[PDB]
Amino acid sequence: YTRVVWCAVGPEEQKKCQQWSQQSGQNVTCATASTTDDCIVLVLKGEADALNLDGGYIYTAGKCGLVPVLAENRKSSKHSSLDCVLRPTEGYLAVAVVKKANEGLTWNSLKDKKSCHTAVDRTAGWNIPMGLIVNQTGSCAFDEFFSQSCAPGADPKSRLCALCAGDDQGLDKCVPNSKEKYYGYTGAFRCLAEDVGDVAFVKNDTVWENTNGESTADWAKNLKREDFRLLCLDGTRKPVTEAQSCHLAVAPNHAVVSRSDRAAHVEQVLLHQQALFGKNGKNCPDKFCLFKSETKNLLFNDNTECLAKLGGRPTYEEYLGTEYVTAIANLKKCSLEACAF
Ligand SMILES: *[C@@H]1O[C@H](CO)[C@@H](O[C@@H]2O[C@H](CO)[C@@H](O[C@H]3O[C@H](CO[C@@H]4O[C@H](CO)[C@@H](O)[C@H](O)[C@@H]4O)[C@@H](O[C@@H]4O[C@H](CO)[C@@H](O)[C@H](O)[C@@H]4O)[C@H](O)[C@@H]3O)[C@H](O)[C@H]2NC(C)=O)[C@H](O)[C@H]1NC(C)=O
Ligand SMILES: *[C@@H]1O[C@H](CO)[C@@H](O[C@@H]2O[C@H](CO)[C@@H](O[C@H]3O[C@H](CO)[C@@H](O[C@@H]4O[C@H](CO)[C@@H](O)[C@H](O)[C@@H]4O)[C@H](O)[C@@H]3O)[C@H](O)[C@H]2NC(C)=O)[C@H](O)[C@H]1NC(C)=O
Ligand SMILES: *[C@@H]1O[C@H](CO)[C@@H](O[C@@H]2O[C@H](CO)[C@@H](O)[C@H](O)[C@H]2NC(C)=O)[C@H](O)[C@H]1NC(C)=O
Ligand SMILES: OC[C@H]1O[C@@H](O)[C@H](O)[C@@H](O)[C@H]1O
Ligand SMILES: [Fe+3]
Ligand SMILES: [Zn+2]
Ligand SMILES: [Zn+2]
């Protein structure tokens, strides 16, 4: 039992982490970086111990010796008697969403359209869609496929950032942190919802959580589920209730990574941390709730029921699975063995 230093990405995540720290008796403390990458670096140097990551980043981190410790687990149906922490992870559905009123827009007519991505290097927002788009066009010119986009993490003055609005003053345009108005799952969908983009690459859960009154946020309160449509790969369009038969791919859950020599200790603290601030935690909602950030998915996704033991002590490759790891490899060829820092 020593402290665990968590790496928060951006001002909002550090605010939430500072609250978590205060409520934990400093059992968990914070470190901040303007970027997920920078946070990986801080963990490599040994200045931060852990952070929760999307599959695309687990891959970057894995190449540098970091290892998945616990995964986020959301609501399911299979394995009912099994507890959340021991229950296998279901994965999540990556989808391409559009406005219904945008008739005639299919997967086959996305060229020169306007796209909203969660952030460069992420699973549903970048890796899967651009992976499919490169293969389909047999070209690495993925910077020239759309006319304009908001793909946080790309060059601020390039087309991939043309649609990003930055912040509130307009500063930090395109930064890969929750301060890019259109950063992440929620931001990319808002990008679509406000008709800035024609399509948004998010996950199925995002569409549901921000429509039909589920979100009390200004831009989303009047959002209706039936005004959106998913783009399947066979060229058709289906209602967002058909996600199960109209997705680009099934993605591995976001997971908490840490240096291999610190993993056991990070795991220990965290389990006890959710016993306190998790879904049924002793001090949530009374004092602090670890998985609630208010439709903002800070540190963790708001739909996390709990952090689950992986098991079978995964290396990063088998946690991400073999078909996904090859998909990233091939995409990375465009822009084999080496840590990127
Ligand atoms: C863009 O294009 C890229 C290139 O076309 C795509 O990458 C290709 O992805 C394919 C699918 O992931 C790979 O093909 C593999 O197919 C075989 C079958 O998979 C096996 O399935 C069994 C379950 O029955 C499992 O045991 C295991 O998952 C297997 O991989 C593979 O043959 C197998 O070899 C293993 C050896 O361990 C063996 O266990 C099995 O018996 C079986 O013989 C085969 O080896 C392939 O891995 C392609 O490799 C891959 N292409 C390249 C260049 O490597 C990419 O997906 C596309 N991007 C997107 C986003 O779609
Ligand atoms: C796309 O993403 C959305 C949002 O993540 C998924 O929809 C959610 O799925 C949950 C489980 O599959 C739904 O159930 C929740 O809410 C109900 C409230 O009534 C709770 O009770 C359940 O009731 C059903 C029906 O009787 C029972 O079978 C269950 O056992 C359970 O008792 C339950 O506790 C659970 O939290 C939820 O309604 C829904 N969320 C929203 C806001 O719509 C959707 O499944 C997913 N689609 C695909 C294809 O993955
Ligand atoms: C901070 O960390 C430790 C985790 O072990 C907690 O302090 C322990 O509390 C447990 C449960 O009451 C005792 O069994 C241990 O003996 C304590 N360890 C010692 C000697 O310090 C503490 O609960 C954590 N704080 C919070 C709020 O999670
Ligand atoms: O982490 C272990 C996992 O490895 C994956 O490759 C596989 O798809 C899963 O079935 C599970 O065994
Ligand atoms: Fe993701
Ligand atoms: Zn599928
Ligand atoms: Zn293994």
UniProtKB/Swiss-Prot annotation:
What superkingdom heads the lineage?
Eukaryota
Can you tell me which residues are glycosylated? N27, N135, N204
What's the PTM story here? Poly-N-acetyllactosaminic carbohydrate moiety seems to be needed for TLR4 activation.
Q: Is rRNA-binding tagged as a keyword? A: no
What does the entry give for GO biological process?
A: antibacterial humoral response; antifungal humoral response; bone morphogenesis; innate immune response in mucosa; iron ion transport; negative regulation of apoptotic process; negative regulation of lipopolysaccharide-mediated signaling pathway; negative regulation of osteoclast development
User: What is the disulfide pattern of this chain?
Assistant: C7-C39, C17-C30, C64-C339, C84-C306, C116-C191, C140-C334, C150-C164, C161-C174, C232-C246, C284-C289
Per the entry, what this protein does is: Transferrins are iron binding transport proteins which can bind two Fe(3+) ions in association with the binding of an anion, usually bicarbonate. Lactoferricin binds to the bacterial surface and is crucial for the bactericidal functions. Has some antiviral activity against papillomavirus infection. N-terminal region shows strong antifungal activity against C.albicans. Contains two BBXB heparin-binding consensus sequences that appear to form the predominate functional GAG-binding site.
Entry protein name: Lactotransferrin
Say which species the protein is native to: Bos taurus
Q: Which gene encodes it?
A: LTF
Section of the entire sequence shown: 361 to 705 of 708
